[PDB]
Structure 1
Amino acid sequence: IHVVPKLPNSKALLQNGVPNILSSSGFKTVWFDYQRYLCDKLTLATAGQSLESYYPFHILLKTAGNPLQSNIFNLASSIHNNHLFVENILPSAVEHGTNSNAVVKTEPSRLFLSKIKDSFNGSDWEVVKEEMIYRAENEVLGQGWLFLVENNEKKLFILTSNNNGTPYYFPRNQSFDLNSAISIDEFATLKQMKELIGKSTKLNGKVQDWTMPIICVNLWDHAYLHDYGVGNRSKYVKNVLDNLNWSVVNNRIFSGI
């Protein structure tokens, strides 16, 4: 059985929500309700099978290449992504419930701001945030996820997913919406991706992708509607990126010590 993880300072979260982003009702929808909804569906889908003993991140990797397990993949991807989003927007990862700590001033580290300049042609963090808000509004028509990811070449770049798209495995990033029209450049990217997946010799037709997320923003209606409303998702993404917990985001960047 997959159970909803306990969050630090949960009593505060159920009373005052997440300050500057979500209210108490908004956080109950995104985490206490939706995370319960996802975990229960995952348990029903995976109970009695070998996947029941694996964590959601491992389930999505195991099932990423199986077309008829997409339902399990979607549930595992959503569960992992939601706790990636709830973790970097959380007031404090440490449990100051008995310490009553009200001073958590987290700021981008030097390694993060050095990789931002290197990967974005000298752009500042503030400018990159504006590009992230723009990318979300023009690339994610409906539900999806906004990620700041790091690849095998030490370069930070921006990835957007439609519905439950994993950042780890490029064949399942779901960054192109094929319901609408696509340019020849987008079709080239899809055609090149298909060729890479066909070069793999494995009988499971799986490739190696070492991309890892650094920041996760939930773009689903379960996270913003109640507090911002239809059409105000760009005001929601702005608040999230301005109130990130950088103790978690800094720890996601590999240092090598």
Structure 2
Amino acid sequence: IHVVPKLPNSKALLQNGVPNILSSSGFKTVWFDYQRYLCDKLTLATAGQSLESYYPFHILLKTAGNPLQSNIFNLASSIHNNHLFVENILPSAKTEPSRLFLSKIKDSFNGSDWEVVKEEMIYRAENEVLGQGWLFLVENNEKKLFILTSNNNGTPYYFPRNQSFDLNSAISIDEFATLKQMKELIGKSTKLNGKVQDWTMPIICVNLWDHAYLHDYGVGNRSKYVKNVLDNLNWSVVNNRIFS
């Protein structure tokens, strides 16, 4: 069975939610109900199988390349993502970005400030994620921090399942060429499962699902919610997520 993790200061979380982002009934919707819903579904989709012994991160890595297990992958992704996000907005387990994080921002985002990159993240989430998705600030193997936007339950770890492009609507030739290159690179792998190496790891994660903002913000105003999230990150966690 997969069980929802116990959070630090759960009583305060149930009484007053997360200050400056979520009310009590908002955090209950996004964690104490959504995470329970996802863990129950994952348990029902993996019980009596090998995957029941693995953590959601390992499940999503194992099932990422198998088309028919996509539903499990989705669950295993959202669960994982939903705890990456909650963990880095929890009040505590005044935190400030580390020198290393800001140094890597200056070395990645054209020597820009952190607030400018925050505004870029607001813009990226506003445009490239129609409906449900996730916003990430991720570190590649090149020590480069970049902004990644996944639709629905795409993962930041494995690029063939990023789901960063909405193919329901029209796409630019640049995006199509990107997809073609990624398809060729996937075909380049020799492993019979057809998997590839991808060392991208998430530094910051924001939940753009309606379970996070809809109750407290409204149908619009997701930009306000994302702004509140990024202005009130738990920088102890975010600083620990960067390799020293």
TM-score > 0.5 by shorter chain: yes
Following superposition of structure 1 onto structure 2, how do residues 17-28 of structure 1 map, counting pairs within 5 Å? Answer: 17-28=17-28
The aligned counterpart of 2:113 is 124
Separation in 2, partners of 1:220, 1:121: 30
The unaligned stretches of length 5 or more in structure 1 are 94-104
- Residues 70-123 of structure 1: CA deviation (Å, up to 9, x unaligned): 000000000000000000000002xxxxxxxxxxx0000000000000001110
Following superposition of structure 1 onto structure 2, how do residues 161-180 of structure 1 map, counting pairs within 5 Å? Answer: 161-180=150-169
Shift of 1:7: 0.1
Shift of 1:248: 0.1
| Aligned with 1:159 (options 148, 171, 177) | 148
Separation in 2, partners of 1:117, 1:33: 39
SS at match of 1:177: coil
Shift of 1:171: 0.1
- Residues 119-139 of structure 1: CA deviation (Å, up to 9, x unaligned): 011100000000000000000
Shift of 1:30: 0.1
Separation in 2, partners of 1:62, 1:212: 16
Separation in 2, partners of 1:237, 1:52: 33
The unaligned stretches of length 5 or more in structure 2 are none
Separation in 2, partners of 1:152, 1:122: 19
SS at match of 1:187: helix
- Residues 152-195 of structure 1: CA deviation (Å, up to 9, x unaligned): 00000000000000000000000000000000000000000000
| Aligned with 2:186 (options 190, 193, 197) | 197
Shift of 1:19: 0.1
Separation in 1, partners of 2:183, 2:166: 16
- Residues 41-64 of structure 1: CA deviation (Å, up to 9, x unaligned): 000000000000000000000000
Separation in 1, partners of 2:170, 2:110: 30
CA RMSD in angstroms comes to 0.3
Separation in 2, partners of 1:186, 1:65: 21
* 1:115 to 2:104 alignment: yes
Shift of 1:207: 0.2
How many residues align? The count is 244
Under a length normalisation based on structure 2, what TM-score does the superposition of the two structures give?
1.00
Separation in 2, partners of 1:192, 1:167: 18
